[PDB]
Amino acid sequence: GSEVDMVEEIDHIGIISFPDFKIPSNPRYGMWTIKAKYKEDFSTTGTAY
Amino acid sequence: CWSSWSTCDATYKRSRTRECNNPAPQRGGKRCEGEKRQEEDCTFSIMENNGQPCINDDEEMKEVDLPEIEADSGCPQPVPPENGFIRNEKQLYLVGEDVEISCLTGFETVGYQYFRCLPDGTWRQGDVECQRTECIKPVVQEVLTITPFQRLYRIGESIELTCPKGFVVAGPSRYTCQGNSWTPPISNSLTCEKDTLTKLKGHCQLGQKQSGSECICMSPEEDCSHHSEDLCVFDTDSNDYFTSPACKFLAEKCLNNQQLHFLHIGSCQDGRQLEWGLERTRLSSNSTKKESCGYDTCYDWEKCS
Amino acid sequence: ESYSGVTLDPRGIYGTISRRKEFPYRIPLDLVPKTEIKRILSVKGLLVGEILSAVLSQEGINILTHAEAELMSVVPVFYVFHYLETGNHWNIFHSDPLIEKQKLKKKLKEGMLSIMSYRNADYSYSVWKGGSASTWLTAFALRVLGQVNKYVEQNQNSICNSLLWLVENYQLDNGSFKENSQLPVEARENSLYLTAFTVIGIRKAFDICPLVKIDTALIKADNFLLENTLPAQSTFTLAISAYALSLGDKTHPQFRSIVSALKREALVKGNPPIYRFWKDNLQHGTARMVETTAYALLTSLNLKDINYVNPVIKWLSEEQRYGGGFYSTQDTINAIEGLTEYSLLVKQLRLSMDIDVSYKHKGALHNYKMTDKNFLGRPVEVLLNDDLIVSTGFGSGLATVHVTTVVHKTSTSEEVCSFYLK
Ligand SMILES: *[C@@H]1O[C@H](CO)[C@@H](O)[C@H](O)[C@H]1NC(C)=O
Numbered sequence A: 001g002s003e004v005d006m007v008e009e010i011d012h013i014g015i016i017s018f019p020d021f022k023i024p025s026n027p028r029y030g031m032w033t034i035k036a037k038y039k040e041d042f043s044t045t046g047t048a049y
Numbered sequence B: 001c002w003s004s005w006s007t008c009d010a011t012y013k014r015s016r017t018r019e020c021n022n023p024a025p026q027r028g029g030k031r032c033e034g035e036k037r038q039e040e041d042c043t044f045s046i047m048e049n050n051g052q053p054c055i056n057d058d059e060e061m062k063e064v065d066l067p068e069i070e071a072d073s074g075c076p077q078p079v080p081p082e083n084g085f086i087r088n089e090k091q092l093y094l095v096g097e098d099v100e101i102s103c104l105t106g107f108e109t110v111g112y113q114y115f116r117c118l119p120d121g122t123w124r125q126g127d128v129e130c131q132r133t134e135c136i137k138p139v140v141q142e143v144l145t146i147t148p149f150q151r152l153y154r155i156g157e158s159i160e161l162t163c164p165k166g167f168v169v170a171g172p173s174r175y176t177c178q179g180n181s182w183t184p185p186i187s188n189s190l191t192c193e194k195d196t197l198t199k200l201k202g203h204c205q206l207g208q209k210q211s212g213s214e215c216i217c218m219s220p221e222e223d224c225s226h227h228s229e230d231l232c233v234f235d236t237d238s239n240d241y242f243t244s245p246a247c248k249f250l251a252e253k254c255l256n257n258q259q260l261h262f263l264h265i266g267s268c269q270d271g272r273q274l275e276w277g278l279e280r281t282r283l284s285s286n287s288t289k290k291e292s293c294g295y296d297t298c299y300d301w302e303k304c305s
Numbered sequence C: 001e002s003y004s005g006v007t008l009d010p011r012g013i014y015g016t017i018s019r020r021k022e023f024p025y026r027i028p029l030d031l032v033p034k035t036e037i038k039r040i041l042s043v044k045g046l047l048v049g050e051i052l053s054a055v056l057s058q059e060g061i062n063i064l065t066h067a068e069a070e071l072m073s074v075v076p077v078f079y080v081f082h083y084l085e086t087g088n089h090w091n092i093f094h095s096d097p098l099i100e101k102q103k104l105k106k107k108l109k110e111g112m113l114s115i116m117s118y119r120n121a122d123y124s125y126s127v128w129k130g131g132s133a134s135t136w137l138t139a140f141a142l143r144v145l146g147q148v149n150k151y152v153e154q155n156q157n158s159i160c161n162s163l164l165w166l167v168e169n170y171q172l173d174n175g176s177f178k179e180n181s182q183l184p185v186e187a188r189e190n191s192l193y194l195t196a197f198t199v200i201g202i203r204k205a206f207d208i209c210p211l212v213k214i215d216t217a218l219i220k221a222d223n224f225l226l227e228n229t230l231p232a233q234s235t236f237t238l239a240i241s242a243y244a245l246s247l248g249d250k251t252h253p254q255f256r257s258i259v260s261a262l263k264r265e266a267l268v269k270g271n272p273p274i275y276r277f278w279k280d281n282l283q284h285g286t287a288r289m290v291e292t293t294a295y296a297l298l299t300s301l302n303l304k305d306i307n308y309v310n311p312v313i314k315w316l317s318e319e320q321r322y323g324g325g326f327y328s329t330q331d332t333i334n335a336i337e338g339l340t341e342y343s344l345l346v347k348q349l350r351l352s353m354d355i356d357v358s359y360k361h362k363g364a365l366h367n368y369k370m371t372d373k374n375f376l377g378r379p380v381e382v383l384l385n386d387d388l389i390v391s392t393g394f395g396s397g398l399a400t401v402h403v404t405t406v407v408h409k410t411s412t413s414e415e416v417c418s419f420y421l422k
């Protein structure tokens, strides 16, 4: 349930490409989570696993 | 009417003076009924609340509730290690949140000090403990006047406690703290009792005090059960060598037997050398009085000097 | 084995300032032949909850420049002047910031000249003409004077002798304080107020004029509040004594027991609480509860806790509080100070910290730049074997660095396991 890393990216296309994430030297096994927000000014959320 | 309403001032409750002037004279007989000036509190706001304000009436204790919703999946407030002290106190912690623990005065956190909330309601409880860097001044009593005097004491430092100007603490006089933190009793405390060497108001100890006229004597055995160091005395027609605790020495010498008096000295365990000094106690009123040195044995038994 | 971690404090908010931390590189005897030791590091923390409210600006137009009330007149000015510097906003008025600030200093210059008239040749302070002596005014005045030292200046030799008169005379052997100027159980409560009130004033001026005899007095002063506040007497009594002790050592065992006893007497509104307040009377211009909350607020602000403070500020921002307060300014000044201390605490944590993790004898591994946008840090592998040292610049905020060392350990170490198996 602990947050790992955050990344912000500009969207030109409508398809937002993000730099590849990576698993830490000593990973914590289980089902991870990916949440997305529009930052300013919207509250729109998304969740991936 | 009413007039004189003023802006907030010196003290100041707004004056609002009242005059009886409507009438005007008169056959006399007279005046009017009421108070001339109120003199009600003045108000002020800083304020900028926006305001509005909008408020309703409700109160809680610690209200029972319970506030806890486990559908939100979060941990309760954790129990700190020995000597406790968790910072940023909360009622409910979120999953994945970690809270740092610190030690009360005075110690030092040793090892990894943090508590992380698991997906399940328990805590990680990483290895941590509290090592004692410094030991703190005991509660004791106002009688001392304790040395050395600091806020806290480092390991290896010893403290000395004495009760002036009279009496004594009777022990322990000095103790060092390795945590540890000595062994002072806080239950019975110390409460220094007047020394036997103190001349001033020494006969009032058995008095009690506050009654009646006031302090004189206590009897028969009610002054006993105390340590009462042993002393060897002889009197009252029985005339044996005896021995006796200091409890009954000041007992036998009192309103009761002092008319037949009593005798004397000590501190002999009865004994070898000091015995022949009592031999030798046979000269008292013979043939007139006792003038030698302290041959009168003072009157109230002193040091003497 | 995580085995280590530290919370970096740039401003030294909690106790001492913490910047540099050395993570030692050690080799256990249980180590497997060959292999290696791997270490990972990350950073996180802060995220202040709410910005909440503010104060003034009508007060500047209301009370700034707007017989014996001269004291009450100039007293809040010092507390008001502190907020303006803490909030750092003089920009609200049409006039130039320097024109306003320099105009305010003249009011404080007259304020120190107005408080000088209340000083007797005894170096103490008296209310009317110097006819009688009161410890209360001598204490209350020392709070205001302690505020000046952070701004303009004050002469030590002239101020220091004012503190001596309390220890030389008015400090009881029991540690309690009393004044000359004038239900048996009521006597204990009245002593705690007089004790705590003096502890505040003295603690304020103690830093400007360090003295061994005064420092000795504080040990006996605070210790009196620790042992005698054990039973519950009055919330207001408990509040002031808690704040006086909050100015001292906050890590004291008996102090936490006092704070805990104070939090139980606290009243709230909402689940979770929207507002948190304190009411003195049990089963009870008329509102005296503003003082007990202001002391409790300042107590938690000195404990540097946002979460507990936020509901209290909401209560002092807008309430049935009116007011509706007296002396004054004895009630108001503690609210101004609370809002002054609060605006500081919010400013105290900006998470502007810049963290640089490097090896002791080797080059920089990585550097984290913490902001409001990024409050988090990515796990970084520590492979090469050397002492690891993480440090920070000046910055603003609070952050916690965690470093875990993963080392494969045999198991041929049964010397530790105490079991021979075949
Ligand atoms: C001391 O003096 C008188 C003198 O005649 C003698 O009778 C008496 O027995 C002696 N007193 C004592 C107490 O032995």
Ligand SMILES: *[C@@H]1O[C@H](CO)[C@@H](O)[C@H](O)[C@@H]1O
Binding pocket: B001, B002
């Ligand atoms: C004096 O009082 C009466 C009522 O007490 C009002 O008519 C009047 O305006 C004034 O306040």
